[PDB]
C-alpha cells in the first residue's frame, strides 16, 4: 500500500493554517467604522513545521484605497519597525520557503507563504496593510500589520537521506549508508524532529512500531516526499518504538524511532496518595490524608533564562478548570479564583505541549514549555475532593 507522502494528507476543503484575513467583506475588515477605531495586529511568533501563513486582501479594483507594504508582500518583507527597510525574503536566511499568490477568486486575493523548520536562525518579518486612504463620512480608515517570527527550532533536527536527490540546504543527515540490514534505530531526545526523505512510504508510516508498545508523535507532517516525526515532549516508558517502511532501490528500508531517557522531574504538586506513580513530581502533599478543615496550598516557582521542562498536577479529585488547557488567574488574598483564561494567552508563549493521563482515579495534567517567556507570570489550578481543596500556583519567570 505504498503511497507518496504528499498523498497521505487526504483532502480537506478547509485551510488549516495561519489565516490573517483582511477583507472588507470579512469579519476583520479594514474599512472605516464607528464600532472599532484601532488597527489589527496578526502576530505569529513561533516555529513552523512546513506551515502556511495566509494574508487575505481585498481586490485592487473593488477597494483601490487599500494598499499593502511592500506591494509584493511575502516576496519582499519589511525588516524594521522604525527604519522601514524592505528586503528580499530570499536573503533573510529562510530555507525551502515558498510563496503562492492566488487571484482567481473574484472577492479577495490570497497570499500564502509556506515555511520549513530548517531555518538556522530566528527570523522576523512584517507586512503592513494601509487602508487610511479610504475615508467615509470624514472618518479615516484603519491600518493593519502581520508580524511573523520564525523561531529557529530549539532542538536538533535529523534527516534520513533515502532519496536519490541531494539536499544541500540542510546538511545534518544519516543517508543510506548508515542503515544496517536496511533497519535504522535512532535514539532521539524530546522535541527532536526526524525529517525522513522517501518517495514511497507505508500508508500507516510512523503510526505502529514493531512491538515495544507504541507512542504517538504530536505531529506527523507529510510534505513533498518528506515525513516529519516530531518526538514527544514527555515519555513514561523505555520499551517504546515507532516503525516506518520504504521500498527505495527495491529494498524494504525500515526505520525505527525510539527515545532513550524518560520521566523528567515534573515541577508540580502530587496530591495523590499513590507513592508508586510512574510520574515524579517535585512537591507532594496528600489531600485524602488531610482533614476536612484544611485548605492545601502549594506553589511551584521556576526561574531560568530558557525553559525546557514541564509543569504538572496529579490529583484524585476533580480539577477546576480543565487544566492545563485552561487555567485560573492570580486571585489571592481576595477570593477563590473564578475566571478562566487560556494558558497560551496566559503565559504569552505559543506551541506549549499539553499532556493528560488517568492513573486509576488519579487525573494527571501536564504542560511542557520550550523557549523563553516574555514576562514573568503566574496562574493557579484547583483540585477539589469531597469538600477539601488544593490550590497549585505556578510562578514562571
Amino acid at each position: 500500500d505504498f503511497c507518496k507522502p504528499s498523498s497521505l494528507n487526504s483532502e480537506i476543503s478547509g485551510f488549516i493554517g495561519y489565516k490573517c484575513n483582511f477583507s472588507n467583506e470579512g469579519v476583520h475588515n479594514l474599512k472605516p467604522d464607528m464600532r472599532e477605531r484601532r488597527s489589527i495586529f496578526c502576530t505569529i511568533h513561533s516555529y513552523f513545521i512546513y506551515d502556511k501563513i495566509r494574508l487575505i486582501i481585498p481586490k485592487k479594483s473593488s477597494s483601490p484605497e487599500f494598499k499593502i507594504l511592500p506591494e509584493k508582500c511575502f516576496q519582499k518583507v519589511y525588516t524594521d519597525y522604525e527604519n522601514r527597510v524592505e528586503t528580499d525574503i530570499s536573503e533573510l536566511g529562510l530555507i525551502e520557503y515558498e510563496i503562492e499568490e492566488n487571484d482567481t477568486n473574484p472577492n479577495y486575493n490570497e497570499r500564502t507563504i509556506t515555511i520549513s523548520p530548517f531555518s538556522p536562525k530566528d527570523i522576523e518579518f512584517f507586512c503592513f496593510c494601509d487602508n487610511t486612504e479610504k475615508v467615509i463620512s470624514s472618518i479615516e480608515g484603519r491600518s493593519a500589520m502581520v508580524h511573523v517570527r520564525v523561531l529557529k527550532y530549539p532542538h536538533n533536527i535529523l534527516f534520513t537521506n533515502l532519496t536519490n536527490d541531494l539536499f544541500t540546504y540542510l546538511p545534518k543527515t544519516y543517508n543510506e549508508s548508515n542503515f544496517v540490514s536496511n533497519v535504522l534505530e535512532v535514539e532521539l531526545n524530546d522535541g527532536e524532529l526526524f525529517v525522513l526523505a522517501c518517495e514511497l512510504i507505508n500508508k500507516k508510516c510512523f503510526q505502529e512500531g514493531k512491538e515495544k508498545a507504541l507512542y504517538k508523535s504530536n505531529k506527523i507532517i507529510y510534505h513533498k516526499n518528506l515525513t516529519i516525526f516530531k518526538a514527544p515532549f514527555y515519555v513514561t516508558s523505555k520499551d517504546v518504538n515507532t516503525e516506518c517502511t520504504c521500498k527505495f532501490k527495491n529494498n524494504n528500508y525500515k526505520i525505527v524511532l525510539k527515545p532513550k531517557y524518560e520521566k523528567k522531574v515534573i515541577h508540580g504538586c502530587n496530591f495523590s496518595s499513590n507513592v508508586s506513580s510512574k510520574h515524579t513530581f517535585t512537591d507532594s502533599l496528600d489531600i485524602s490524608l488531610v482533614d476536612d478543615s484544611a485548605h492545601i496550598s502549594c506553589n511551584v516557582h521556576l526561574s531560568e533564562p530558557k525553559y525546557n521542562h514541564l509543569v504538572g498536577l496529579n490529583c484524585p479529585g476533580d480539577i477546576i478548570p480543565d487544566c492545563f488547557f485552561q487555567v485560573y488567574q492570580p486571585e489571592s488574598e481576595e477570593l477563590e479564583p473564578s475566571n478562566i483564561v487560556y494558558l497560551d494567552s496566559q503565559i504569552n508563549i505559543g506551541d506549549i505541549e499539553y499532556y493528560e493521563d488517568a492513573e486509576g482515579d488519579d487525573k494527571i495534567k501536564l504542560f511542557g514549555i520550550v523557549g523563553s517567556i516574555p514576562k514573568t507570570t503566574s496562574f493557579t489550578c484547583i483540585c477539589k475532593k469531597d469538600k477539601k481543596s488544593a490550590y497549585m500556583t505556578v510562578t514562571i519567570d
Partner: antibody
Amino acid sequence: QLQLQESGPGLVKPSETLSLTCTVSGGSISRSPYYWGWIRQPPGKGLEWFGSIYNNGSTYYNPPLKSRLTISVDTSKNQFSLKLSSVTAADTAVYYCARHGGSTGMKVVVIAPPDYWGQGTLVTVSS
Amino acid sequence: DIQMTQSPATLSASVGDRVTITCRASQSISSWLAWYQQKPGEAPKLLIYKASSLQSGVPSRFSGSGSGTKFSLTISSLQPDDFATFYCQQYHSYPYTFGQGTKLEIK
C-alpha cells in the same frame, strides 16, 4: 480519632527549665503534613502561642520567643516535647498541645486551624 | 505580628435570643479564621473552621459571617449548656493570634 495527651511537672522551682511531652494516640506523626505546636493559657487570661516544629524536625517559634524554647519530635514513640528555660513567676499556666497547619509563606504547606487539642496540664512557678 | 480582637467584652442574654460576636484583624488574613468556644476548665472546641463555614458535629444554630478584616459569628436561639468563653483566631501565618474573648452566660 487522633488525641493528644500532655505530661509534665505540676510545679517547678523559679529560675529553672520546664519540660513537657505530648503523646499522640490513634494517629501518627511520621507521615503527617501537619505541624504540632504549644499554646499557653495563664489562669484568668486568653491564649498565647508557643512555637511549632514539623515532623522531620523543623523549627518555628514566636518572634519574641526564639531565645529559650526548644521543641523536638520523637517519631518512634509518636511524641513531641517542649523545653522552655528560665521560668518566671508569671509563667504559671495550662499548656495545650495543638495540631495545626503551617503558615502561608512556605512553598508547600497545609493551612488549617488547631484541631484536636490536648486536655491541658497545669504548670506553676510559686515561692 | 497580626493582632486580633474580639468584641464586645462580655455578653448577657436570655434563652432563645440571637447574638452576634465581632472579630477584627490587624492585617489581611484572607478568609482564614477559626471560632472556638471553651467551657471553664476544659479544652477549647473548634466551633467554626473557616469564616462563613461550619464544623461538622455542631448544631446548625451557629452561623459564620466574615471575609477580609471584619468577621462575625451569630448564635440563633440559646441553650442552657451554651455558657462558655469564645476565641477568635487566625490560622494564616505564624504566630497564631487569639482574640481576647467574650463570656456567654444564661440570664
